[PDB]
């Protein structure tokens, strides 16, 4: 309705584009309500270029006490980049939210595209899925070579550009380790993209990121995760039980190479899980799934994707049911919070 007007205005903006503050960004519809607030499309005043603005609403932040989580995601994504990790362009605040304004990926997210292809077509066709898997792997590999444990990765964080190349994007709750440590304790990341080790409150290495990859890949092809049903997400406690206990069964949608590859990643013990085998993560790269994709051309981005996102249609949801969490009642901001908000902004 009004959302359609906003969507029409987005289409108008895209047309102009194809052809920092409250007086610097045109606002369009929200595309979802994330962990700490809404994430809406927006457009530069002086450039006429489209950006996503991951808003972390101040009210929702205070409620969840999500101040730590915000700073981690910021600093990490800000520092680490490749051609499979998108740039962060601005970090400002308005009056009601902290903003991360990040670089173009107007092609939507992989999760959207699972259902937008058709919902009676589960995931992508096998060559198209294989291509994207190869690209995701390269992005993870780049993190691992820098000795970074991500503890995350999900379909919604794998974005398509308009070329059709995929990139991981938005580096959330993670830790960048130095050379001279690989094992660290903690409970971090979004449940279901966390491996057994984290959930049980034990040390973990690079293995866990490869666990997340397994979950991602499985959802990409089958249109449901190994630990959740089609277009569903279960409660954290149940999800924790699933990750620890639930054996993975494989549809016939998968090719044999992709089945075997998924099995290798989704093992519950790090020792039996493909990834870091104590001398390389290039043992993973030897798997027959990647016989279709040359590594040299892949890493340099010289391979054409078997799908090119159309620019005459606009991807991502338009508000019609998005999540929500409390906004403040009697709850009044601490001095500490105000200092965090300024500090967050660059």
């Amino acid at each position: 309705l009004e959302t359609v007007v906003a969507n029409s205005a987005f289409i108008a903006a895209r047309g102009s584009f194809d052809a920092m503050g409250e007086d610097w960004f045109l606002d369009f519809r929200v595309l979802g309500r994330g962990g700490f607030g809404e994430v809406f499309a927006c457009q530069m005043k002086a450039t006429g270029k489209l950006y996503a603005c991951k808003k972390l609403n101040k009210k929702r932040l205070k409620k969840r006490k999500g101040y730590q989580g915000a700073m981690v995601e910021k600093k990490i994504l800000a520092k680490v980049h490749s051609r499979f990790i998108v740039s962060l362009a601005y970090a400002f605040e308005t009056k009601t939210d902290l903003c991360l304004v990040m670089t173009i990926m107007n092609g939507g997210d992989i999760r959207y595209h699972i259902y937008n292809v058709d919902e009676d077509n589960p995931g992508f066709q096998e060559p198209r899925a294989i291509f994207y898997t190869a690209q995701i792997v390269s992005g993870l590999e780049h993190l691992h070579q820098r000795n970074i444990i991500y503890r995350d990765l999900k379909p919604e964080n794998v974005l398509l550009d308009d070329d059709g190349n995929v990139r991981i994007s938005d580096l959330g709750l993670a830790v960048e380790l130095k050379a001279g440590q690989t094992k660290t304790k903690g409970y971090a990341g979004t449940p279901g993209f966390m491996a057994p080790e984290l959930l049980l409150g034990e040390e973990y290495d690079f293995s866990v990121d490869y666990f997340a990859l397994g979950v991602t890949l499985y959802e990409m092809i089958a249109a449901r995760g190994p630990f959740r049903a089609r277009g569903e997400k279960v409660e954290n406690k149940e999800l924790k039980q699933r990750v620890l206990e639930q054996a993975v069964t494989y549809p016939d949608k998968f090719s044999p190479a992709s089945k075997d590859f998924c099995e290798a990643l989704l093992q519950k013990d790090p020792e039996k899980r493909l990834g870091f085998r104590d001398g390389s993560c290039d043992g993973l790269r030897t798997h027959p799934l990647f016989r279709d994709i040359s590594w040299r051309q892949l890493e340099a981005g010289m391979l054409t994707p078997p799908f090119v996102p159309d620019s005459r249609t606009v991807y991502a949801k338009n508000i019609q049911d998005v999540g929500a969490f409390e906004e403040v009642k009697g709850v009044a901001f601490e001095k500490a919070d105000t200092e965090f908000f300024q500090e967050f902004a660059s």
Partner: antibody, heavy 123, light 110 residues
Framework: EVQLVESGGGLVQPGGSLRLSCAASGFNLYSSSIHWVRQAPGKGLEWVASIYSYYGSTSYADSVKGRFTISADTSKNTAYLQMNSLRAEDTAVYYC????????????????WGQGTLVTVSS | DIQMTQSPSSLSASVGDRVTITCRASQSVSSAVAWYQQKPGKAPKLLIYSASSLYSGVPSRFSGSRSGTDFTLTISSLQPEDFATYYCQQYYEWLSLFTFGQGTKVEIKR
């Protein structure tokens, strides 16, 4: 259970060639890797060759490498070993065996073997 | 190259004994040890797979322990058919052969 019944043995001249067949049952061939292992009489076991589950990658033990060519037909569910160049040490009972996955896949090991088929290299 | 050693080379045992044999790889092939029993008139038969995990349809008399480059196979109680040659295998390649031990002969003490 899974079972392999070999055939195609016999007496064969030195420096000749012979093709062994291993007929597979209890599984779909395209869904399992297949290998050949041989046993010299009253001795250990030497692995000969492997070929991938959905067929595409091959590995060989150095002594038999190139000389013997492992192959399979998933349209017959039968694995073959084409043996070119025969030597005195090649006189052996020949076993096919099965293998699952490839490059870490519940960390397999060689789980089903044939009963062997006798190859006699002699003149 | 991959060199598989076992010890004892041979051992004299009787039925209902605790037999412990070890296997050693010359380089680290990770936790990756199968144990096979071979005895005349039979084809090789899997006992233990993975690293120490008992294979399905195998008696629980056989068990394995340890990790690293030093693997163990323990037979808790012998039966009269456990006088045989026992081989370890490591089942990995880089394109190197799948390597088996030289067999450990459990023989009848007298």
């Amino acid at each position: 259970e899974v079972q392999l019944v070999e055939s195609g043995g016999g007496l064969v001249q030195p420096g000749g060639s012979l093709r062994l067949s291993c007929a597979a049952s209890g599984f779909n061939l395209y869904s399992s890797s297949i290998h050949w292992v041989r046993q010299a009489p009253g001795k250990g076991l030497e692995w000969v060759a492997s070929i991938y589950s959905y067929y595409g990658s091959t590995s060989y033990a150095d002594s038999v490498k190139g000389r013997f060519t492992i192959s399979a037909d998933t349209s017959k569910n039968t694995a073959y070993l084409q043996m070119n160049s025969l030597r005195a040490e090649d006189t052996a009972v020949y076993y096919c065996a099965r293998y699952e996955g490839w490059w870490w896949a519940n960390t397999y090991a060689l789980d089903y073997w044939g009963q062997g088929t006798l190859v006699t290299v002699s003149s | 190259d991959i060199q598989m050693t076992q010890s004892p080379s041979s051992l004299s045992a009787s039925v209902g004994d605790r037999v412990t044999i070890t296997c050693r790889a010359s380089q680290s092939v990770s936790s990756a040890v199968a144990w096979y029993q071979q005895k005349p008139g039979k084809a090789p038969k899997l006992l233990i797979y993975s690293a120490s995990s008992l294979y399905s349809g195998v008696p629980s008399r056989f068990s394995g322990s340890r990790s690293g480059t030093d693997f163990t196979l323990t037979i808790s109680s012998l039966q009269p058919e456990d006088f045989a040659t026992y081989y370890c295998q490591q089942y990995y390649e880089w394109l190197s052969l799948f390597t088996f031990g030289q067999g450990t002969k459990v023989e009848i003490k007298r």
